[model samples]
Target: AMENKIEVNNKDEMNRWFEEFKKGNGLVDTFTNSYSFCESIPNLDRFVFQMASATDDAQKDSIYASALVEATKFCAPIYECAWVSSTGIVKKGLEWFEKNAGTIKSWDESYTELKVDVPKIEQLTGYQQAALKWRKDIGFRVNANTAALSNKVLAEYKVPGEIVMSVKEMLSDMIRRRNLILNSHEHVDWCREFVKGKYIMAFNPPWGDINKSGRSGIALVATGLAKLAETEGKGIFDEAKKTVEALNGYLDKHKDEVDRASADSMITNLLKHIAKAQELYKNSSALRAQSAQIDTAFSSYYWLYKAGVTPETFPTVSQFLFELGKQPRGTKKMKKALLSTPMKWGKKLYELFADDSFQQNRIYMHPAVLTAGRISEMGVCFGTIPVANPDDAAQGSGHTKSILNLRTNTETNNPCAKTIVKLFEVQKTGFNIQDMDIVASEHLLHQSLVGKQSPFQNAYNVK
Candidate 1:
């Protein structure tokens, strides 16, 4: 029958096959034969590297005009990823871009009005152009020693000497560019602009509420402050201090003015930056005092929650608690000082559970409801809790069992839960978790919360 065939000729059948491939039940042999294996390369850098590694002279000759052109389309995406100070794909891609500068067109030339017929270089995206320009301004070496340009790797692949020599020249140019960028005031100006513009105002979302802006603002501001501290001289420290002082003042003044959720979220953001600033200027008593003030504000807020405020009034209260719950446990001295408040809050919250007002509260009555969820969370933070899994009774048992039960429960039978549990187990044996694992876990968790089937369900074991 036609259904028994190993391959499909039409679009609909091909789509079906693609779906099956995703589920790990497709004809992979046919798929591999149908498409170029290099098409599977994830980014421009990898594509270029693979192109250079080609053994066939015909293939190598044809590469610069075809797939290399195709790879140019990815410049913006790769640049966006590289701007963040992290490892993995973005870093590698940027390095590759740097190494292949001779072949890659400059942003200015790429964005000009008329499309010039450049021999090998191609146009880039606007974002790619901007990022490249910014890096150029900051002394980033576009021709730096990239892995793809490494003589060792190139020699091993038996890449041609002309291509290798071109890469070496690119490296030499990068060194010159690096010196120029480092000696300029462009980086200093950029840092100041970042603090004055996006970094400070990050908490105020342009399109949505504080909750919608989310925790990214905290990370951005914290990282920005740290970067500024590392690079800038004493003059910039005054601006940094001023920014923190302004934020602290705003928090103190608006603690009661804003809704409890917004207040807590903002305070959490403040605390993160305060910690970073303290590290940067350890002797600055002002930073330490600001920390104490923020700590006091959080303690006061905890009692306000215990005072029978309904969850409807502050919908994000549980999220606030979870944020606070993770804070005090960071360092030994911080643990001792901050431990008492949450512990007391948990005890009082438990006592309130016996009250009629607490019982009548819709969010508090149900075990599944999260509105008044701070009690159990704070209990966990206080280290006075047991594993939530029914099967586990061990005193110091890890939460993997509980996490597994919650995910694979009858009401919500998540298939990828076991895989996460296995990951946790692996982590127990000192396995260094990869970026892919963190990203995958976040994606899976988000999917589970939004009532979507995890993409990993078929690939990973279910129950």
Candidate 2:
């Protein structure tokens, strides 16, 4: 009942099978033509065309393998750049700080009071101004001594005063240290020299000192450049490149010292340099080259499947790619599954397996599903408005009974619909549901019922 399954044990076998599969299925030409303009690989179209037009199976196999290798080579540096541009350097620095928290804490507490005048409101940077405004908005006393008043405001605002005070203290320390690291006056001097392409001797300070005292400033510059890269277009790439180069040169010169540093310190320093480089070259040609490689690497599957491998043999494209790399040491799980089903039934079984696996992994709660649920809930409110009874009807007549019936029908037929109807009832009376001041409106209702005059009754005629 079963045919012998094709066993691929090496690269040549895999490539050979792929060639036969391509010839039978015509997929090689189809993809080669279809994906030539792929954005990830700048010259991918031309590359695919070259592969498609190869003189023989040997030539095609060689070209395909070479393409995979070239793509891998191109992508490595680009991924490195992406990691840096994504504020990966700042994250590394923060991780270093966390790992050495006790040391930094001691240094911060005992650090000399470097006397620098607090900036005037007119002289404050936009970020500083915003932070000051936030402090005031949170009812923190930014000016004169007002601990008593601040605590009172905090309680009234339902804010935790102690937490705010602690956070403000930490922020104050970070700002002070950041200013010192940039060394107020020298910061302007460094930027001036940097713009002129002069590598200032001061820029080559010990990485450890910079890590300890200047981490906040490092993070600020890294994040600032990252933000600039998003808005300022390609100009930032050059500046970032230069900064990274300078840092790299310094690190190389002090390789011995760097070797002695902790792993966290080394990684933190490395990330700082790489981060700027990434900003400098965001979406540059080099990145596109690497992105193309990733695309080309995954595209190998198209041929692998065409050669007679069932999609069921690898539940996901990722699994297939992984197996392709493993060569002779292919997955035992895949081998067992293939052998368990007879070859004659394998294709159908694999199809069933793929379908079931796909469904299991499929995302059930998509945004569209949530949106549909919201709309359905909103739809329940339609036609649910209580009909007003005829004005001439008797007070104890069946009108009350009719309203009760309408409510019962709505509530019974619509699951979880009572709250929405109640919300509508409150809306009709002009009560703002979100208003904290009206914590409970039953007091106003009681006042109106007793004929007692109140502001709410006077304004809304609640009765």
Q: What TM-score goes with each of the models? A: 0.19, 0.17
TM-score of 2: 0.17
Q: Which residue segments of model 2 deviate by more than 4 Å? A: 1-192, 195-208, 212-220, 223-234, 246-270, 273-463
Clashing pairs in 1: 98-142
Model 1, span 1-463: residue lDDT tens: 1011113333354445445433542212121111111112212233346454667644543442233223211111111111111122223323444454443334323322211221111222222233344334333222221001111111111222323443333335434543642333333344466455234453553433322322445344444445455444334556655665676577677777657776567656655654654455443222222211111111122333343333232212223332333232222333333334454433343333322233332311211112222232222211111111211111221111112112223332222233332232222222223311122223233333322221101111111
Question: Relative to the unseen true structure, what is the C-alpha lDDT of residue 325 in candidate 1, on a scale of 0 to 100?
Answer: 30
Model 2 per-residue lDDT at 235: 54
Error of 2 at 319 (Å): 70
Residue-level lDDT for 287 in candidate 2: 30
Number of the top-ranking candidate, with TM-score as the measure:
1
Clashes of each: 1, 3
